[PDB]
Design a protein around this ligand. Structure first.
Ligand SMILES: [Ca+2]
Ligand SMILES: [Ca+2]
Ligand SMILES: [Ca+2]
Ligand SMILES: [Ca+2]
Ligand SMILES: [Zn+2]
Ligand SMILES: [Zn+2]
Ligand SMILES: [Zn+2]
Ligand SMILES: [Zn+2]
Length: 229
């Protein structure tokens, strides 16, 4: 309803547009910034389109900020990854297959190569978790934030976490693990969110896409090749 729409917008803006840290116009300017970035008509109002976007599942990484113990790109060309645990939603090989295909998306357009490790420290540590799980971004239950990932660097940098309160699927018939994994790997390699609704790195989950027809946008390719040549 209406007051909840108010509460949803505030929580959305604080989460992804650094709203916090007495001028009703302060919230208005953040609305406008979110509308511009996500491709909505810039009304500064909490209109029906804006609230629908705010209700949609999406990546947990914010949309503002690009900024560091970390780095803008990996300096090595040979990167390692590890699937630390698995969702019960899918068979082991389906999770493995989804991550391998998402890795191949980026291998095809960069000089980067990826090796799998089953034990110990890998650059890209990949796991599934619910609610609080030992970093700064607790997951939020079904829907909303689906996953997040961190830019290049040591330790928790480059890692990928999937919210296991989503129902992860192998087809476009649900929350597709491959598609989310491919987006989150973008973060792991140094990319930020795109304002191109067609781009993989756009922040909202794209549930109207035939997997056979999936392809990186020219914006995604230009972005990753600006980093890795
Ligand atoms: Ca098998
Ligand atoms: Ca790491
Ligand atoms: Ca969630
Ligand atoms: Ca689940
Ligand atoms: Zn709609
Ligand atoms: Zn993201
Ligand atoms: Zn470690
Ligand atoms: Zn996390």
């Amino acid at each position: 309803e209406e007051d909840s729409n108010k509460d949803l917008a505030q929580q959305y803006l604080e989460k992804y547009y650094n709203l916090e840290k007495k001028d009703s116009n302060l919230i208005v300017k953040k609305i406008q910034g979110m509308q511009k970035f996500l491709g909505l008509e810039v009304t500064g109002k909490l209109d029906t389109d804006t609230l629908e976007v705010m209700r949609k599942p999406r990546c947990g990484v914010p949309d503002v900020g690009h900024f560091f113990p970390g780095m803008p790109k990996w300096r090595k060309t040979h990167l390692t990854y590890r699937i630390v645990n698995y969702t019960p939603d899918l068979p082991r090989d389906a999770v493995d297959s989804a991550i391998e295909k998402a890795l191949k998306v980026w291998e095809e357009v960069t000089p980067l190569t990826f090796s799998r490790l089953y034990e110990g420290e890998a650059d890209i540590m990949i796991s599934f978790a619910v609610k609080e799980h030992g970093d700064f971004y607790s997951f939020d239950g079904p829907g909303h934030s689906l996953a997040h990932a961190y830019p290049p660097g040591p330790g928790l940098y480059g890692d990928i976490h999937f919210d296991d309160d989503e129902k992860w699927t192998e087809d476009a018939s649900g929350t597709n693990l491959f598609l989310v994994a491919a987006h989150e790997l973008g973060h792991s390699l140094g990319l930020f969110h795109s304002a191109n609704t067609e781009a993989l790195m756009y922040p909202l989950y794209n549930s109207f896409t035939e997997l056979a027809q999936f392809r990186l946008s020219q914006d995604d390719v230009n972005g990753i090749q600006s980093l890795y040549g």
